């Protein structure tokens, strides 16, 4: 009956940010002090809720979204930001109610010669709406002439590899991110703090 936060935070594999993973958390007791008292995380930051109240509140559900980005991109995981990640990969709404947690994962997600496994969406016709997810790989039309699904001149694959290398600077190193959203419905609350 303790919420399965460890499955999210301690998962062996993490998604690319364009295909960010979501886990529904419901019908459990959430002790958030396990997270906000951990020295493992460099970022723990809340919006529309105070950490002083986290263990005293009840919610219908909480959503845990996880993924990998650059360190200097962790600032984009917040309301009212723009940039490649917030525009094309993962967008938080102005009225976001939740917390963002992040930590450097250079030891796990970098590889000598460059890691081809983590990617982000480099091209898109328009910005994502908040909490929208796009995992398509349609050839992107950069010129005036259509591509007709064929990669080539002025017609680019929409995903770009981070190519994480362990020797890059800390801002360019991979970071694992978990975003907790707290949902209130006109239904009974099912995730509660220890009280």
């Amino acid at each position, epitope marked *: 009956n303790l919420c399965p936060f460890g499955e999210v935070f301690n998962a062996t594999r993490f998604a690319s940010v364009y295909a960010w993973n979501r886990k529904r958390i419901s019908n459990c007791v959430a002790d958030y002090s396990v997270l906000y008292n951990s020295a493992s995380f460099s970022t723990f930051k809340c919006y529309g809720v105070s950490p002083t109240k986290l263990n005293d509140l009840c919610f219908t559900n909480v959503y845990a979204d996880s993924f990998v980005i650059r360190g200097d991109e962790v600032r984009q995981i917040a309301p009212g930001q723009t940039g490649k990640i917030a525009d094309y990969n993962y967008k938080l709404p102005d009225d976001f109610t939740g917390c963002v947690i992040a930590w450097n994962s250079n030891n796990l997600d970098s590889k000598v010669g460059g890691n081809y496994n983590y990617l982000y969406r480099l091209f898109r016709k328009s910005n994502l709406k908040p909490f929208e997810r796009d995992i398509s790989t349609e050839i992107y039309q950069a010129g005036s002439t259509p591509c007709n699904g064929v990669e080539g001149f002025n017609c680019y694959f929409p995903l770009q590899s981070y190519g994480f290398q362990p020797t890059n600077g800390v*801002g360019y190193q991979p970071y694992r991110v978990v975003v907790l959203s707290f949902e209130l419905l006109h239904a009974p609350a099912t995730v509660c703090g220890p009280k």
Partner: nanobody
Amino acid sequence: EVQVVESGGGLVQPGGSLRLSCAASGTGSTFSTYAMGWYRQAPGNQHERVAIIDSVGNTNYPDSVKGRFTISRDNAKNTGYLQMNSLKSEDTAVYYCNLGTIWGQGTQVTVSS
């Protein structure tokens, strides 16, 4: 019963320094067993953890304050500290601390000319 009070805050000119104190009461011989953290509030109910120290002294900080803020703990005095160097106008906020699951009301820090 456990309680924490913050102190050492106030007005400071840019580039100045402050040393905040998180003083605990009602802990017996047990203060050392809890983690302790420092947070700052921004308008819009935005709360940023600015420093964390666990029961064995492991620390961490976000990038915005790394190199400028240092958290420390005194298990004999049941007190913790946040050393804030090279303050900036953006560092203006209410700063509050926690010990385990107990929170303080906070104190104001203002960086202005």
